[PDB]
Every structure is written in structure tokens, then in C-alpha cells.
Design an enzyme around this catalytic site. Structure first.
Site, short mmCIF file in Angstrom:
data_model
loop_
_atom_site.label_atom_id
_atom_site.label_comp_id
_atom_site.label_asym_id
_atom_site.label_seq_id
_atom_site.Cartn_x
_atom_site.Cartn_y
_atom_site.Cartn_z
N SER A 53 48.06 58.10 84.55
CA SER A 53 47.85 57.34 85.96
C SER A 53 48.86 57.68 87.01
CB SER A 53 47.21 56.09 85.77
OG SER A 53 45.99 56.03 85.32
N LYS B 163 48.67 59.62 90.02
CA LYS B 163 47.99 59.17 91.04
C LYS B 163 48.89 58.78 92.32
CE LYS B 163 43.91 56.36 89.27
NZ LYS B 163 44.18 56.45 87.96
N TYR C 109 40.20 48.79 90.34
CA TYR C 109 41.01 49.94 90.04
C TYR C 109 39.94 51.11 89.45
CZ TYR C 109 44.47 53.00 87.78
OH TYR C 109 45.52 54.00 87.62
N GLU D 144 51.71 51.17 94.18
CA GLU D 144 51.57 49.55 94.32
C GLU D 144 52.96 48.94 94.59
OE1 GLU D 144 49.24 48.18 90.99
OE2 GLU D 144 47.93 50.00 91.01
N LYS E 113 54.32 52.16 89.33
CA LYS E 113 53.23 52.73 88.76
C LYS E 113 53.33 52.96 87.39
CE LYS E 113 48.78 53.82 89.40
NZ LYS E 113 48.45 53.25 87.96
N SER F 109 49.12 56.22 81.34
CA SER F 109 49.01 56.44 80.22
C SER F 109 47.91 57.55 79.78
CB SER F 109 48.64 55.02 79.20
OG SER F 109 49.75 53.93 79.17
C1 LIG Z 1 45.92 55.92 83.91
O1 LIG Z 1 46.83 55.91 83.23
C2 LIG Z 1 44.56 55.50 83.25
C3 LIG Z 1 43.20 55.93 83.73
C4 LIG Z 1 42.50 55.37 83.15
C5 LIG Z 1 40.77 55.50 83.19
C6 LIG Z 1 39.87 54.75 82.17
C7 LIG Z 1 40.98 54.38 80.92
C8 LIG Z 1 42.39 54.42 80.99
N1 LIG Z 1 43.13 54.33 82.17
C9 LIG Z 1 44.31 54.67 82.21
N2 LIG Z 1 45.31 54.29 81.34
C10 LIG Z 1 45.57 52.96 80.82
C11 LIG Z 1 45.77 52.88 79.42
O2 LIG Z 1 45.12 53.54 78.72
O3 LIG Z 1 46.48 52.02 78.87
C12 LIG Z 1 45.18 51.82 81.80
C13 LIG Z 1 45.22 50.52 81.21
C14 LIG Z 1 45.42 49.14 81.93
C15 LIG Z 1 46.23 48.28 81.72
N3 LIG Z 1 46.98 47.89 83.10
O4 LIG Z 1 46.64 47.72 80.86
C16 LIG Z 1 45.23 51.94 83.32
S1 LIG Z 1 46.57 52.63 84.08
O5 LIG Z 1 47.99 51.73 83.91
O6 LIG Z 1 46.82 52.89 85.38
#
Ligand SMILES: *C(=O)c1cc2ccccn2c1N/C(C(=O)O)=C(/C=C/C(N)=O)C[SH](=O)=O
Ligand code: NA
Length: 363
Positions: free
Chosen positions: A63, A66, A149, A274, A317, A320
Site C-alpha cells: 500500500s 499509494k 480506506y 496520511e 504510510k 504490506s
Molecule cells: C496495502 O498494503 C493493502 C491493500 C489492502 C487491500 C485489501 C487487504 C489488504 N490491504 C493492504 N495491506 C494491509 C495488510 O495486509 O496488513 C492493511 C492492513 C490494515 C492494518 N492497518 O492493519 C492495509 S495497509 O496498511 O494500507
């Protein structure tokens, strides 16, 4: 006035315990301090091959990709090709459903369209089915009232933002952002000649890497950005100090990405990036990184017009993929920053806690 010797110890004493506690195979870290990047590498990029992490190792950003999207969108705005105030339908006239009236490019870019879901469904396997998805979508909230998000939100912003240029997302990103900033080892699609630097990600002991999605206007972004710690450090430096970027529109695009468009509790939403006002306590940042809050739909306070970049900010930001975990943060006022690339996705709060600790020593 911490010395380089002291900085090296601070990083080692923080990252080493971190990697052992979270079972991280390898990590590449870069700290920006006193006008330049300082590199520290730990562990293995490939466990079975016994290859060590080096400043050339490629990691999956997830992510954090982004932030590149936000800047590319900012650049297009600075060029006059798009406006965040334009309706989404101006760039995709085939999107005829009336639920889209009142939804702006700004809403797509900042997750405020009204509940677009986290991901685009797997059933979407081409452009005709992507249109069907957006046409059938029924918002749960009015535009500009709730932040949720969503890749289905910013992903569409990215695809539509490059339309006027006539270039596909990958090409527009390379031509207008990467090449100008000399990020020549940053890719969407890693060239077979560079694959030897591509680390393996690890999930529950298995070596894994990102996979491609179905061909579409969102396929490159979905595939995400891969890069090494040197290019990433330079990415942080360009965003930390856009005043040193020569291209007039890119410089403005970087500024637009760090502008504050909405306030959600103690954070502010930019384009990709952010922000939180600095100074900020560690628990505020760490607690906000928890998925329970990071993925919840929360009320927004509009910042109209958008507030230009605030130097006294904590800009960050997290990102993962299946086998990678990365985090970037910087404080313009202090001109200090950090990049942490790892080949295992460990808890975001642990990433934030560690980054905060290291930067706290430089403040
Ligand atoms: C970006 O890294 C991203 C995109 C999406 C869409 C669907 C599922 C996963 N996310 C991710 N990564 C993750 C992750 O797998 O750990 C996120 C988890 C959320 C959190 N804050 O714990 C969102 S990421 O940090 O933008
Ligand atoms: Na579905």
C-alpha cells in the site's frame, strides 16, 4: 547533534530485537538525517539461497504504492489535466448510474465516495466487468461524510487521473515520476535482468511473492510497486523537500499529495500520504495503526480549501503484501525520515513503534 556512530547503534539496537521478536528474515532500513540517507541492512533476502539483504534488494511496497499514485495524480492536477473538484463521470462518461452524481475525483482519491469497498471483487476480470461493478455499487453514505480506506476507491482515481495523458498507469508513472527523480530501480513489473535482486517474501514459513491481477485499467497498480532501499530513501527525500525537485508540475504534485483534505480524529488524509500534526505522542500514532481503526468507516471533517503541506507534520504510510511488510515516515520541520523494508508482514503497530523510537532520537 547525534553522530553517525550513535545513529548506527540506535538503529541496530531497535531493529535487531524487532526482527527476532517478529521473526523477520531480512530488513533494509534507511534514515534521512542531515541532508543525506544512511543505510543499514540486516538478515536474508532469500533464506534457502542464503542471499543477504543489500541496498540493491527489491522489496514489495504494498500500500505504500499509494503514495506514488497520489503524487502522480497531484502532477496531473498541476498540469491542468484534471481537477480534484471534477465529477468522476467527467473522466468515465460510461459510468451513468445516478448514485455517482456529487462524487468527485477528490472523494475517490481520499476514500470518501461513500463506502466503496476495500477491494475490487475477483469477479471483475476486465474493463466491461469493472464498469458493471461500479455501476451496481450502492453507497452506504453520502459523499464527503465518511472515510473508508479502499483500493476500489484510490485505484479508480489512479486509472482515471492518467486518462488525459493518453498513457497507461505504468507508463505515466515511469515517465512523470520515477525517471525525473532518478528512481531507476523501482518497478511495477521487475525486468528479468533485475530479478536476481528481488527478495522472496515469507508467510508462515513459505517463500512467496506478489501475483498479477486480471488485465485492466487497475492491473498495474494492483500489482504494486517494487523498489530497493536507495530509491525508497530518495523517494522520501523528494517528498520531504519538494523545493529541491526541479520539474515544476512534479514539485507541485508532491505538495498536493501532502495537503490536508479531511480531518479524521487526530489524523489528516492527503493523496496516498496520511499526516498527524507534530509533535505527536507515540501511542497516538501506534494506536491509530491498528486494523480495527485503520479499516473502520469513520466520520470526516472537511478541510476547505485543502490545507497546503504543514512542515510540522508526521507524514507516513504503512504497506504490506502476502510476504512483505514496509513502513515510511518523515517530519519535514526536522528534515528527518525513515524507511523500513522487510520480507515478512509483521504487525503495523510494531513498525510504527520502532520507527518512532529511532526518529525520536534524532529530534
Ligand atoms: C496495502 O498494503 C493493502 C491493500 C489492502 C487491500 C485489501 C487487504 C489488504 N490491504 C493492504 N495491506 C494491509 C495488510 O495486509 O496488513 C492493511 C492492513 C490494515 C492494518 N492497518 O492493519 C492495509 S495497509 O496498511 O494500507
Ligand atoms: Na462480489
Amino acid at each position: 547533534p547525534v553522530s553517525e556512530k550513535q545513529l548506527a547503534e540506535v538503529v541496530a539496537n531497535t531493529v535487531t530485537p524487532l526482527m527476532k521478536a517478529q521473526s523477520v528474515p531480512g530488513m533494509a532500513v534507511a534514515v534521512i538525517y542531515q541532508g543525506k540517507p544512511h543505510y543499514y541492512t540486516f538478515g536474508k533476502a532469500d533464506i534457502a539461497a542464503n542471499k543477504p539483504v543489500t541496498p540493491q534488494t527489491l522489496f514489495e511496497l504494498g500500500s505504500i504504492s499509494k503514495t506514488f499514485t497520489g503524487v502522480l495524480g497531484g502532477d496531473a492536477i498541476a498540469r491542468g489535466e484534471i481537477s480534484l473538484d471534477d465529477p468522476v463521470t467527467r473522466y468515465w462518461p460510461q459510468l451513468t448510474g445516478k448514485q455517482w452524481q456529487g462524487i468527485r475525483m477528490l472523494d475517490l482519491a481520499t476514500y470518501t465516495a461513500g463506502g466503496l469497498p476495500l477491494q475490487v471483487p475477483d469477479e471483475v476480470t476486465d474493463n466491461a466487468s469493472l464498469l458493471r461493478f461500479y455501476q451496481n455499487w450502492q453507497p452506504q453514505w453520502k459523499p464527503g461524510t465518511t472515510r473508508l480506506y479502499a483500493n476500489a476507491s484510490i485505484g479508480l482515481f489512479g486509472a482515471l487521473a492518467v486518462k488525459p495523458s493518453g498513457m497507461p498507469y505504468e507508463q505515466a508513472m515511469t515517465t512523470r515520476v520515477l525517471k525525473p527523480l532518478k528512481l531507476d530501480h523501482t518497478w511495477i513489473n521487475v525486468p528479468k535482468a533485475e530479478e536476481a535482486h528481488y527478495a522472496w517474501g515469507y508467510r508462515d514459513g513459505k517463500a512467496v511473492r506478489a501475483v498479477r491481477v486480471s488485465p485492466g485499467m487497475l492491473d498495474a497498480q494492483a500489482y504494486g510497486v517494487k523498489t530497493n532501499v536507495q530509491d525508497m530513501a530518495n523517494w522520501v527525500m523528494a517528498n520531504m523537500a519538494p523545493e529541491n525537485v526541479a520539474d515544476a508540475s512534479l514539485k507541485q504534485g508532491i505538495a498536493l499529495a501532502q495537503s490536508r483534505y479531511w480531518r479524521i480524529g487526530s489524523m489528516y488524509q492527503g493523496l496516498g500520504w496520511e499526516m498527524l500534526n507534530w509533535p505527536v505522542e507515540a501511542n497516538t500514532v501506534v494506536e491509530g495503526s491498528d486494523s480495527k481503526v485503520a479499516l473502520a468507516p469513520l466520520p470526516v471533517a472537511e478541510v476547505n480549501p485543502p490545507a497546503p503541506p504543514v512542515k510540522a507534520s508526521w507524514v507516513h504510510k504503512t504497506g504490506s503484501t502476502g510476504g512483505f511488510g514496509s513502513y515510511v515516515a518523515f517530519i519535514p520541520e526536522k528534515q528527518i525520515g525513515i524507511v523500513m523494508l522487510a520480507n515478512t508482514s509483521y504487525p503495523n503497530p510494531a513498525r510504527v513503534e520502532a520507527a518512532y523510537h529511532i526518529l525520536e532520537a534524532l529530534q
